[PDB]
Amino acid sequence: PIQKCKPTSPGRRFVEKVVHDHLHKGAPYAPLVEAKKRTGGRNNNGHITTRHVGGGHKQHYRIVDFKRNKDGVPAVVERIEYDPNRTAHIALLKYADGERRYIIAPKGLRAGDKVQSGNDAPIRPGNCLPLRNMPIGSTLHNVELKIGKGAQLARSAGASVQLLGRDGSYAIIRLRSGEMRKVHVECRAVIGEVSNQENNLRSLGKAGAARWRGVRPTVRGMAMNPIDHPHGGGEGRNKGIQPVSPWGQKAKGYKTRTNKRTTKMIIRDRRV
Template sequence: MALKKYNPTTPGRRQMTGYTFEELTTSKPFKALTHSLWRNHAWRNNTGRITTRHQWGGHKKSYRIIDFHYVDKLDIPAKIETIEYDPYRTSYIALVCYRDWERRYVTAHKDMKVWDEMITSKNAKLISWNRLEIWNIPVGLSIYNVEIIVWKGASSVRSAGSSATILSQEWEYTQVKMPSGEIRLVHKLCYATLGVVSNTDHNQVVIGKAGRSRWKWIRPTVLGKSMNPVDHPHGGWEWHSPIGMPYPKTPWGKPALGVKTRKRKDTNKWVLRKRDWRLMKK
């Protein structure tokens, strides 16, 4: 994938970059697999108060129904019909047509082309974008759309340009190195797709101007110290003063920045190393 740089006709355009969309083959989605999530409530409730901060407005968009399970199409080959843009995710998506003539959207591989074939099978060939049980994947290969819980569908490694790596196959579990650096145990009956997610240059895009963020439904974020005391614990005093307390707080008075918020400890047994490479305490 390549990025395009705009001519500096305005200050906002001077550093702005964007997608060339050269991989895409169509600009219109398959209507039967879309529905609208648009609600013109601007993230306010019935009394007009903001219920979700930092979101408002934005361009209207349709949600594409993506298949993250695949398992009800075991051993049924499919052909790639189109590579498309999805406004609700950073990666591209592919419209596939199975041999039984059912069409579904799936996450696109970075090298996927129209008329390529894919299949979901327990012992599928080791070809990019094929999906198979994780114990059949050799050590060192890259994977994405990883299942963490058996038969629950792909829940990890789905964003643009991401991939996990198989580190070892031991007993009932496979050691997988996640994109964050965390090493996690995944049950061998879980499925994963071979390869790397599409749109690998997504993190290189320069937004360029504030208005482009507003198109994405993103409102500005303001420091608490710039607010009034009634709006934030850090607020008040003159100009851009220090927060005036020993540790930072959230707008609701809870400790912030560096405070551990993970409450679900029963899943710690599946994590061998944290993303900072420290061993997980059991």
């Protein structure tokens, strides 16, 4: 319903959040949780390689089953949980033999629903099948690119791709960016669309909200000195230059793709 908070304080005036009353409220499933540590955007040389990263709340990693290789064994959904590592919700699955796993929760999936994976899985949301066995025209998520590697495409909240056709050994899918591309027909995908589709309707409201998520402030190149940035310098406000990055790469319209090994797998570019 997208609640807007009442302006009892200026930092609260513009806060907009979402309720999801069906999410589990207790602790996560301990055997599938492992420790994670903050990096600060620094690599093994100790240098900053990604600016504006640091701080934020402490988080545990949730072991999510992207491969879905427990074939032929039906499972039931126990609960839906909030995952701090991503924008989608996760679903805890209990299989018929007692094992428990985590999966990306499709939209509409609730406690008590049944899921399955394999060639003969029924066509239901949350079921995992090879693209060869998927009906043409369906909407899918968690698309896998290499056989046996697991889902890589369309995993964020509200994600989905469309299966437009399947010719030869390659299926044709349209991605959310607008790109049409081929995927080998033995790669697997999941029926349905990713949950939490209202994720992008939230408003943080204040700087502290971003600080809680671990984003440090961005400083414009215009505000610097010439030694720091190509945009730096000048008396007063003046741009006087075609915009570039701190390392001199143009920022408005200049294309940066250089890979030549995967070019054959893209059939229609989305006007990059």
